[PDB]
Amino acid sequence: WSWESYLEEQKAITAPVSLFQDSQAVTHNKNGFKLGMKLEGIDPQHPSMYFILTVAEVCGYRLRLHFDGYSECHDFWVNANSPDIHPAGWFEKTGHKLQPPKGYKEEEFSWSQYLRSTRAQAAPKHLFVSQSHSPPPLGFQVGMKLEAVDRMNPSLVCVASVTDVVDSRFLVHFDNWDDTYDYWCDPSSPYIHPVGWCQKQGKPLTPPQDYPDPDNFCWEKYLEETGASAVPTWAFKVRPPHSFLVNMKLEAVDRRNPALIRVASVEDVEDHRIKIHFDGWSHGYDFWIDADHPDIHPAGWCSKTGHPLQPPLGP
C-alpha cells in the first residue's frame, strides 16, 4: 500500500502540507519520550486540572499516558509536541494545582519523595514545547472576562472568564458552571468575543448559571461586583478560514480507537472546521473537527514518524 498508488486509483489529492499548522505537519522531530517516564498533564475530560502521568506506550511521534493510581481505562494518546503536558515540578513554579496520585493528599505529595518511592525517572525538560517560558497571549490576563460559545451547547454565547494562562494559550471558563465546559484557546479562537459582542450583534447573551433577573444582566454591573476587567478588544485577533477543500485526502486519528490513524477524506467544510470521512468505512463514522486539532495530519505523516497507517477498508 502506498499513498501514490491510492491517490492514482482514486484520482484524488492530498491536502497540501501548507494547509496544516506547523505542529500538525512536523515529522523530523525525534520522540524522546520513554516508557515509564513521569510528567504532569491536563486531564482531557477536565481541561482545567493537572495530574501525574506516566508514559505507558510510545508509537512513532505519539505517546500513551496513564494516570498514576487510576484505572488504565483512562489512558489517552497525545503527540510528543503536545502543549498539554509539562515537566515534573512545573505546577509549583507556575501557580497550578496538581492532583496527587489516587489515594494521596495534596500536601502529602512531593516529586522528590514520589520518584524515590517509585524509583522512576521524570521526563527531561527539553522534551516539552510548553514550560510557561514563552510569550503569553497579549492582553489575556487571568481573571479577565469575555463572551464565549459554549462548545457543548453551541447555540449559546455566554459570560466567561480567563482562568489559566500557559505560554501562548489561555483557559476559558463558563462562570458558575462546572469545569467540564472549560476549553483552551489562543487570541484568534473563532469561539471567543469581547465583552459586548452579543449585544452589538443583536444576539442573546447567556448569563452565569442562575444569575438574578437573567434578562437584565448588565456587563458593567457584573464586572464591578466581581472586581473584574474585560479582556480588551485589541487582544482579539481574526483567524483566517482554512483552505481545505472537499475530497482532499489526509491522515486522521480514529476517535473510536485512538491508537489508530487512518486514511481520511474531507467530506464537508466550514470556515474553521472540516468533516472527516474514513475511506472504506461507513459514513456513520464521519465527524467534525477543528482545522487546528492536533489529530489531523498531511499524507506521509505516519510513514515519516514511524506510526502505522491504516489503509482504506478494501472489498
Binding site: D150, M152, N153, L156
Partner: peptide
C-alpha cells in the same frame, strides 16, 4: 452530558 435545558429548580 445533558444539554442545557430550561428548568424550574
Amino acid at each position: 452530558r445533558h444539554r442545557k435545558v430550561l428548568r424550574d429548580n
